[PDB]
Write a protein that binds this ligand. Structure first.
Ligand SMILES: CCCCCCCCCCCCCCCCCC(=O)OC[C@H](COP(=O)([O-])OCC(O)COP(=O)([O-])OC[C@@H](COC(=O)CCCCCCCCCCCCCCCCC)OC(=O)CCCCCCCCCCCCCCCCC)OC(=O)CCCCCCCCCCCCCCCCC
Ligand SMILES: CCCCCCCCCCCCCCCCCC(=O)OC[C@H](COP(=O)([O-])OCC(O)COP(=O)([O-])OC[C@@H](COC(=O)CCCCCCCCCCCCCCCCC)OC(=O)CCCCCCCCCCCCCCCCC)OC(=O)CCCCCCCCCCCCCCCCC
Ligand SMILES: CCCCCCCCCCCCCCCCCC(=O)OC[C@H](COP(=O)([O-])OCC(O)COP(=O)([O-])OC[C@@H](COC(=O)CCCCCCCCCCCCCCCCC)OC(=O)CCCCCCCCCCCCCCCCC)OC(=O)CCCCCCCCCCCCCCCCC
Ligand SMILES: CCCCCCCCCCCCCCCCCC(=O)OC[C@H](COP(=O)([O-])OCC(O)COP(=O)([O-])OC[C@@H](COC(=O)CCCCCCCCCCCCCCCCC)OC(=O)CCCCCCCCCCCCCCCCC)OC(=O)CCCCCCCCCCCCCCCCC
Ligand SMILES: CCCCCCCC/C=C/CCCCCCCC(=O)OC[C@H](COP(=O)(O)OCCN)OC(=O)CCCCCCC/C=C/CCCCCCCC
Ligand SMILES: CCCCCCCC/C=C\CCCCCCCC(=O)OC[C@H](COP(=O)(O)OCCN)OC(=O)CCCCCCC/C=C\CCCCCCCC
Ligand SMILES: CCCCCCCC/C=C\CCCCCCCC(=O)OC[C@H](COP(=O)(O)OCCN)OC(=O)CCCCCCC/C=C\CCCCCCCC
Ligand SMILES: CCCCCCCC/C=C\CCCCCCCC(=O)OC[C@H](COP(=O)(O)OCCN)OC(=O)CCCCCCC/C=C\CCCCCCCC
Ligand SMILES: [Zn+2]
Lengths: 122, 51, 141, 230, 152, 100, 186, 98, 93, 226
């Protein structure tokens, strides 16, 4: 029994088909397997949302006693300096937030004419 | 807290004064009437366009 | 089945309360010693007597529930199980076919009739002189 | 012997997310609100990463806990829609005799029901492949096409509708119910954009959650179609 | 026209131009169209599961063109939606307690127009443009733009 | 493999509930003697009489309802100033000739 | 500050002496490029499948869960002893390193935004493309509509091409560009 | 009776010694199962085919010694010697002596 | 190398006749300087340099373009307004 | 147990890349000095060396055969400890039900520390009472104040350590005759010849004894790219 390359020869007819037919069948097979599926492979491997959650996490040692960082360290800081840096960066924004929030209170207080409480009756 | 309050305060005060003077299009309109008076032309080309 | 149930559809761990029926009772049996005959008085308690792995059946259940996770081939389920696994999928697909080949044709006929006679073919023609298509679900009028 | 649970002792995302929420209130610009929404997305994604990293505990009850949370959430989504249906039917006695044009029962309902049904079929195929430890690349892009068409159709409908929200409580309820469905459709886009094949397979709560949510949204549209269009 | 095949075979061959029918009637051809990573798990599938999957997949993909046709007709209908009578302002119609500004809390564009009231906004944008303030939209004729679905 | 709900629960409680609702409604109508014959029309008797006159040819075709009342509001006075039923009928007649 | 920041490397010798681990890439051991290896093998660069080259760079992830297992010591690159012990890490990395670490801590959020933005751009294109076009004539005079109800209300279904042309001419009259456009004949 | 009959862990074999299911993107190689059944032969058919373990004959004397020392174990060892022990027979032997 | 479950159907090891020198990591051993990773070839860490560089460039382009648009184009309601939102050429306001 | 999650791939076997590269020292290390990975590969190399030598199996005693495979011959001391270990593990995610405790046979409460919280529910049927919680500290024979059920704490403690499978194996198993590397080589040549390797573990193990990279194809096997 002769074995043809996968996806290149039809089994529905003893006649392989005419030139146009064969061109369409061969080229769709190529486009799917080596052109279209480049996008899918790229998204599946290079942009996995679950691989990205384990980025920067230490390897899981085969020796069971060398993975104690799992419970010695909180999961929020499994990333070492990267995870400590993210927390520290947001920490730097505390006082800028206070000034921003305090401004909003001033904005509402002024717009309601609450600063003229004494000037109103003077 | 006061240090970061100043830059926000300055920005909002300028913004508040502007908003009380009128809407964005009312401001551009006042500059359009002035340009029409400077040239003495009833209708002038819109900003960024030639005659 | 889609939803996970610890007792029946336990696919997360694969735990089964009882051994396979294929196994002879001499090889493995369900953990049930409710029928144990009364213990002779001259017998003395050596073990804890606590329900747990000291009982042979329970031990074998735990062992099998872990060693069954590697098998040379698939345990083909019968067609009844396979149908149930995708019951919703197949039913939704047939619903789509109904919407295309049953709902589609008569809805088109009604609109074409409405074009000529102002109201759908399943409605009472009005004489009030108001204009427009009017209601579509006549049995909710 | 180990402890039954690997306790989480500290967390700082909660403070950030709660502050992000306050920014929505304490702001003087709507641009600040747009960028604040991005911050929210980022930090909610970090919380999701914490959930994925909790897999290292090998705790059997984790799947069950998360699954039942989704059940509760779905329930809350169903009850919010109920409240809108309630608002709609309470004023039913003032409908159908006002000088407004209600929606047709031929065009919008059919193409939408046909469209949303195809969305369900795609998700169903995804579930089937999930069961069979297989993947088909084209599936997700069919969802993107379906979402694009849904967005294209809803935008045109609103823009070409000749009755406004202030015309009648009927019109307000129609627009609001349709918008609420759309928001839940957009949330489905948010969830589905990350769909990929993970080799831990049926211990991944994402797959079951997506299937349940998509079915909820489609079923919710059947109820809406009967109430408003038919 | 080839006479080396029957009429039925010819029709089936052409419907198999993309190999769909061949993959249905050959397990080997279906497994060798899978990418190697997923082909590893193929040997466990039953033939029931395989053909049922193809059936669900084929039904879905073959109905997508129909939905696409239905959606195109919808776009054309909306693109040439008939004018409707101007609404008489009834007892409880067009009630306003304050201007429409929730979309633009600070800018307050088109305070009198409703959020998606396109004709009111067009005339409002024209006023702003006449006031030297640029606004986007409502300037190109529909028939002179792409994707309008309003061309004859 | 253990079942929690009725084997056909979805169809059972959906179609079943619809059936009970429909049957209960018929029973309720019988007990109160409610007329069950659907009328799709308005019941304004004077209006329905004017409509018959139009169908009989007593009132010319396409004559507006405000051209027949004994009190007109302001907007209908505006319309009456531009109303020409005779011209409208001639225009329709011209269209029919062109079509055929 | 430390040698690691000055000379970034992935899985070199003397990691502890260098003072820090600058790479989040974990695993390896593949015998070929894109082949089966150990660990998850995730990074901002040089991982996964290359679209331009159409080739696999790293194999599919080997999860530290039931589906996989631990990584052999020969191929471990993130030593927990050096990865942790953050005492005075800011001095070792400097200010630019702190900025780099913060940016690198958000790879998960970056991966999401790369997958989420495209569909939203497409939705925004729908809006922009429609906003440019003149508004369709939603409403006309109440009276005139009812004096020609059949033509207006049913014209579309009977002949859509002529109805489309009629609509276009009305738009050209409503917005005063009729003499500036040539409406194609139907 | 768990996970639809799909084993959580199973062996796969490849004919080409340098084949990698993750690096290569060819479309001709057909994976085999633990017994060696090619993937294109469905499970429903292959599971009916009877597979037995064949040990090298040099092990027969050892398997004989095991049966004699433990007579209850003899029937299973005899099946193994005669090439009549399937996977199920092995499982029965394993759990019987736990 | 992969899972212990995947394996060759015939267990063969090639008698390589090539005379290529052995890569250093192929003959390496665990050492006090290298407790881990001694079997993997050392590589450059591009992410440490490319991530902060690319981020800075994008921010600069993003902000610079925004400033430019909002300062070098006529005042308007949105960015699209400031670009395509003027009156038709020859329409004097 | 029901509380455990799914078997890992490692739960069945370890990758050959985790084999220690200094096999010569590995086979000479005492059991008490071998780590988990070292102990896995010591047993696998030695156990498979004896199992892949059919002509010697019939003349090998079960005591010697068990030693080669690394299996511990059971005895009452070790059985007691292992049993109480498995009972502790089972109770982690299972209910605690058993016979009524008396002075002759107290309820056995396994613990690692010196205390474990316990509740008495009384007897069966009408003799069952509401949960009475008490702290079961070592060295006291506790009696429920309500039903007089006797309790006792059992501690899994041995020589400054708690009881584990590793501890039980180290304390009771005795290292036999030192493993001979000649056996490894002899079995290696038996099943590995002319590019056919029917003992992969012994091909890698012999390569390491030779110094790593000596056997055909092994340099190519050890050359990785990431
Ligand atoms: C996400 C995309 C959504 C698009 C929706 C569009 C809706 C309209 C109708 C479209 C009809 C096509 C099918 C759509 C359904 C999905 C198909 C599918 O699943 O494909 C999987 C297929 C392979 O997927 P995979 O994951 O690799 O394998 C999955 C299976 O395991 C193995 O899969 P399989 O081998 O079993 O295949 C399943 C089968 C199932 O589908 C069917 O059999 C349905 C048949 C419907 C017939 C309708 C009549 O699908 C096919 O056979 C698809 C063949 C597509 C070939 C495309 C080759 C490139 C075309 C480039 C055209 C360039 C034109 C330039 C013009 C320039 C002018 C200036 O995917 C592709 O090949 C990608 C393309 C998918 C189809 C896109 C269709 C776009 C149509 C554009 C028309 C433009 C007209 C312009 C006219 C201008 C006049 C002036
Ligand atoms: C070099 C160029 C670089 C460009 C870089 C990106 C620029 C993004 C900013 C931008 O273009 O802003 C203007 C852009 C276009 O607005 P515009 O109408 O030209 O200006 C606002 C008018 O002043 C007032 O017009 P409006 O009152 O009609 O408001 C339109 C709406 C503008 O935004 C939208 O219309 C939202 C676009 C997505 C619509 C999705 C609808 C989904 C279906 C919902 C239900 C039906 C809706 C029907 C409508 O305003 C705010 O959302 O939209 C935004 O303001 C932000 C867009 C990005 C988010
Ligand atoms: C108005 C708007 C309504 C919107 C409905 C939205 C439905 C979304 C989900 C649809 C879906 O995917 O369903 C198919 C799918 C079918 O499940 P399956 O396991 O493949 O079914 C296998 C066979 O059907 C045979 O299955 P089986 O009969 O052997 O039993 C297995 C299945 C049986 O259940 C189902 O399959 C559920 C089907 C629901 C269909 C709804 C239409 O069990 C579950 O899935 C249980 C799910 C958890 C239920 C928790 C209920 C919580 C509330 C309880 C009441 C609390 C308040 C009491 C107040 C009064 C006190 C006196 O349903 C689910 O898996 C979803 C379960 C969670 C739904 C939660 C909905 C809110 C409550
Ligand atoms: C050779 C090749 C060469 C090629 C060359 C060309 C290459 C391409 C160039 C492309 C250039 C594009 C330029 C336009 C970009 C789009 C801009 C935009 O959309 O915004 C305006 C656009 C429309 O508004 P508009 O009318 O143009 O804006 C008016 C101006 O803002 C008028 O200003 P205003 O007075 O209204 O501002 C008030 C102020 C509010 O003012 C304040 O609150 C601050 C006042 C104090 C200032 C001094 C600092 C004091 C301390 C502050 C402490 C703050 C933190 C405290 C804690 C938190 C409190 C919240 O709000 C803001 O400034 C808003 C932005 C805030 C920062 C956001 C992050 C940056 O806004 C939006 O639609 C929102 C953004 C939507 C698009 C971005 C979405 C981001 C999603 C994430 C991924 C993005 C990836 C991007 C990749 C790009 C690669 C290139
Ligand atoms: C000796 C016994 C012989 C028996 C012969 C039986 C012959 C039966 C023939 C039945 C023909 C039915 C034709 C139905 C055509 C419907 C076409 C139609 O409406 O198309 C448009 C419509 C959608 O229109 P829209 O514009 O979107 O408007 C509606 C939604 N807004 O499309 C659809 O409905 C799609 C589905 C079309 C289904 C066509 C069905 C054809 C059935 C043929 C059956 C033949 C049976 C032969 C039996 C022979 C036995 C010996
Ligand atoms: C086959 C499917 C059948 C489904 C049936 C679902 C039944 C659920 C019923 C729940 C509520 C029942 C309350 C008792 C019935 C009372 C109905 C009634 O009186 O309705 C009108 C009355 C309002 O009128 P008034 O306040 O008097 O004046 C209004 C003037 N503008 O009550 C309402 O507003 C009804 C509001 C409830 C409707 C929605 C119920 C929940 C829907 C769930 C959907 C899933
Ligand atoms: C919304 C919050 C829902 C919280 C309850 C459900 C959480 C859940 O199941 O998330 C996990 C689940 C899968 O993770 P696994 O690793 O399989 O499971 C975790 C460990 N077993 O994750 C997801 O659902 C993926 C989420 C991706 C999209 C996130 C989008 C966030 C949008 C925020 C908008 C504001
Ligand atoms: C998250 C949800 C985002 C929704 C964005 C779109 C909102 C929208 O379209 O609102 C308009 C829509 C239709 O109203 P009209 O424009 O008057 O209808 C006239 C039709 N020509 O409804 C509203 O105005 C209500 C909007 C409520 C707030 C929505 C955002 C939260
Ligand atoms: Zn008691």
């Amino acid at each position: 029994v002769t074995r043809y390359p996968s996806g290149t020869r039809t089994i529905m007819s003893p006649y392989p088909g005419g030139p146009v037919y064969q061109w369409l069948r061969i080229n769709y097979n190529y486009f799917k397997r080596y052109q279209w599926r480049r996008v899918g492979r790229w998204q599946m491997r290079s942009w996995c949302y679950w691989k990205a959650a384990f980025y920067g996490v230490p390897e899981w040692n085969i020796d069971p006693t060398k993975n104690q960082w799992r419970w010695c360290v909180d999961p929020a800081w499994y990333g070492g300096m990267r995870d400590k840096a993210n927390m520290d960066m947001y920490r730097l924004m505390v006082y800028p937030f206070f000034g921003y929030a305090l401004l909003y209170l001033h904005s509402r207080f002024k717009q309601n004419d609450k600063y003229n409480v004494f000037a109103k009756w003077r | 807290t006061g240090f970061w309050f100043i830059p926000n305060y300055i920005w909002w005060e300028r913004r508040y004064a502007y908003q009380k003077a009128g809407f964005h299009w009312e401001h551009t309109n006042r500059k359009l009437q002035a340009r029409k008076e400077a040239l003495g032309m009833d209708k002038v080309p819109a900003s960024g366009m030639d005659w | 089945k889609h939803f996970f149930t610890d007792g029946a559809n336990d696919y997360v761990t694969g735990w089964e309360n009882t051994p396979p029926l294929k196994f002879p009772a001499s090889v493995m049996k369900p953990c049930d010693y409710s029928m144990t005959k009364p213990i002779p008085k001259h017998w003395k308690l050596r073990g804890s007597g606590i329900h747990g792995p000291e009982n042979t059946d329970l031990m074998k259940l735990v062992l099998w529930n872990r060693l069954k996770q590697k098998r040379p081939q698939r345990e083909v389920p019968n067609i009844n199980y396979l149908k149930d696994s995708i019951r919703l999928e197949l039913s939704v697909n047939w619903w789509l076919m109904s919407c295309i080949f049953l709902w589609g044709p008569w809805l088109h006929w009604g609109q074409e009739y409405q074009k000529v006679h102002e109201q759908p073919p399943w409605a009472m023609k009005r004489i009030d002189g108001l204009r427009g298509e009017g209601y579509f679900t006549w049995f909710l009028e | 012997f180990e402890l039954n649970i690997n306790i989480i002792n500290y967390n700082y995302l909660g403070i950030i997310i709660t502050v992000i929420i306050s920014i929505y209130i304490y702001n003087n610009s709507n641009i600040i609100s747009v960028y604040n929404s991005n911050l929210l997305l980022i930090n909610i994604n970090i919380w999701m990463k914490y959930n994925i990293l909790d897999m290292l505990n090998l705790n059997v009850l984790d799947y069950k806990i998360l699954l039942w949370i989704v059940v509760i959430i779905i329930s809350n989504e169903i009850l919010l829609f109920v409240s809108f249906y309630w608002i709609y039917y309470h004023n039913y006695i003032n409908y159908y005799h006002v000088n407004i044009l209600i929606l047709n029962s031929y065009n919008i309902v059919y193409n939408n029901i046909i469209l949303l049904t195809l969305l369900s079929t795609i998700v169903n195929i995804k579930f089937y492949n999930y069961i069979l430890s297989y993947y088909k690349y084209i599936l997700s892009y069919l969802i993107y096409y379906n979402n694009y068409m849904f967005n294209n159709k809803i935008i045109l409908e609103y823009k070409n509708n000749s009755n406004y929200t202030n015309d009648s409580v009927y019109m307000t309820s129609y627009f609001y119910i349709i918008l609420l469905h759309y928001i839940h459709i957009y949330d489905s886009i948010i969830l589905i954009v990350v769909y990929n094949y993970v080799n831990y397979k049926n211990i991944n709560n994402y797959y079951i959650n997506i299937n349940i949510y998509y079915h909820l949204i489609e079923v919710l549209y059947i109820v809406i179609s009967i109430l408003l269009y038919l | 026209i080839s006479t080396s095949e029957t009429l039925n075979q010819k029709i089936l061959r052409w419907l198999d131009v993309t190999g769909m029918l061949t993959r249905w009637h050959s397990r080997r051809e279906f497994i060798l169209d899978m990418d190697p990573y997923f082909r590893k798990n193929s040997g466990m599938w039953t033939e029931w599961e395989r053909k049922t999957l193809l059936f669900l997949f084929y039904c879905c993909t073959l109905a997508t063109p129909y939905s696409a046709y239905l959606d195109l007709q919808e776009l054309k209908h909306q693109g040439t939606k008939p004018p409707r009578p101007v609404s008489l302002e009834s007892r409880f119609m067009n009630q306003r307690r304050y201007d429409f500004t929730w979309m633009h809390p600070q800018d307050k564009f088109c305070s009198e127009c409703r959020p998606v009231e396109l004709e009111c906004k067009k005339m409002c944008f024209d006023r702003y443009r006449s006031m030297d303030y640029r606004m986007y939209g409502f300037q190109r004729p529909r028939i002179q733009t792409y994707y309008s679905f309003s061309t004859c | 493999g253990r079942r929690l709900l009725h084997g056909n629960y979805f169809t059972r409680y959906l179609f079943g509930s619809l059936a009970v609702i429909w049957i209960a409604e018929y029973a309720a109508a019988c007990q109160y003697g409610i007329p069950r014959h659907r009328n799709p029309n308005w019941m304004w008797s004077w209006w329905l009489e004017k409509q018959n006159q139009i169908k009989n040819g007593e009132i010319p075709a396409n004559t507006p309802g405000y051209a027949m009342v004994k009190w007109n509001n302001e907007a209908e006075q505006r319309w009456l100033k531009t109303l020409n039923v005779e011209a409208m009928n001639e225009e329709f007649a011209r269209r029919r000739e062109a079509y055929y | 500050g430390c040698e690691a920041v000055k000379n970034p490397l992935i899985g070199g010798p003397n990691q502890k002496a260098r003072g820090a681990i600058t790479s989040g890439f974990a695993g390896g051991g593949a015998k070929r490029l894109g082949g089966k290896g150990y660990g998850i093998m995730a990074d901002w660069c040089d991982h996964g499948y290359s679209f331009t080259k159409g080739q696999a760079i790293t194999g599919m992830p080997h999860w530290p869960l039931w589906c996989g297992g631990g990584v052999p010591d020969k191929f471990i690159k993130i030593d927990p002893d050096v990865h942790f012990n953050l005492q005075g890490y800011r001095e070792r990395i400097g200010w630019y390193g702190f900025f780099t670490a913060f940016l690198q801590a958000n790879y998960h959020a970056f991966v999401y935004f790369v997958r989420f933005i495209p569909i939203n751009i497409a939705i925004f294109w729908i809006y922009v493309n429609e906003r440019q076009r003149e508004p369709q004539e939603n409403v006309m005079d109440h009276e005139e509509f009812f004096r020609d109800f059949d033509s207006i209300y049913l014209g579309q279904v009977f002949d859509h091409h002529r109805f489309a042309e009629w609509l276009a001419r009305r738009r050209a009259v409503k917005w005063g560009y009729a003499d500036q456009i040539h409406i194609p004949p139907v | 009776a768990y996970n639809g009959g799909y084993p959580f862990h199973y062996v796969v074999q490849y004919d080409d010694p340098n084949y990698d299911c993750e690096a290569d993107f060819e479309f001709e190689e057909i994976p085999r199962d633990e017994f060696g059944v090619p993937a294109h032969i469905p499970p429903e058919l292959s599971t009916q085919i009877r597979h037995t373990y064949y040990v090298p004959p040099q092990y027969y004397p050892f398997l004989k010694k095991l049966g004699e020392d433990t007579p209850e174990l003899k029937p299973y060892t005899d099946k193994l010697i005669m090439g009549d022990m399937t996977y199920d027979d092995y499982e029965e032997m394993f759990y019987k002596f736990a | 190398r992969g899972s212990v479950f995947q394996m060759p159907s015939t267990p063969v090891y090639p008698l390589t006749t090539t005379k290529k020198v052995a890569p250093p990591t192929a003959l390496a051993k665990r050492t006090p300087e290298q407790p881990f990773g001694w079997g993997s070839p050392v590589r450059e860490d591009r992410a440490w340099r490319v991530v902060p560089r690319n981020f800075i460039i994008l921010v600069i382009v993003y902000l610079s373009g925004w400033a430019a648009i909002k300062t070098m184009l006529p005042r308007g309601g949105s960015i699209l307004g400031q670009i395509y939102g003027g009156p038709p050429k020859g329409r004097l306001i | 147990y029901r509380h455990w999650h799914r078997m890992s791939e490692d739960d069945w076997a370890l990758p050959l890349d985790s084999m220690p590269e200094d096999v010569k020292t590995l086979m000479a290390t005492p059991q008490t000095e071998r780590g988990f990975v070292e102990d896995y590969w010591y047993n696998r190399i030695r156990g498979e060396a004896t199992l892949l030598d059919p002509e010697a199996l019939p003349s090998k005693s079960y005591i010697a055969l068990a030693r080669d495979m690394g299996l511990q011959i059971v005895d009452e001391p070790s059985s007691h400890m292992m049993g109480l270990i498995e009972l502790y593990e089972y109770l982690r995610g299972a209910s605690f039900v058993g016979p009524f405790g008396t002075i002759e046979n107290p309820v056995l409460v396994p613990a690692v520390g010196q205390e474990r919280v316990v509740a008495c529910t009384g007897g069966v049927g009408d003799e069952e009472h509401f949960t009475l919680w008490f702290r079961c500290r070592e060295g006291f024979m506790y009696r429920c104040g309500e039903c007089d059920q006797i309790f006792m704490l059992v501690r899994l403690y041995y020589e400054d350590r708690y009881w584990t499978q590793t501890l039980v194996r180290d304390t009771f198993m005795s290292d036999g005759d030192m493993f001979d590397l000649k056996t490894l080589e002899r079995v290696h040549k038996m099943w590995n010849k002319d590019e056919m390797v029917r003992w992969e573990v012994g091909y890698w193990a012999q390569d390491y004894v030779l110094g790593k990279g000596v056997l055909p194809g092994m340099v190519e096997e050890h050359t990785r790219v990431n």
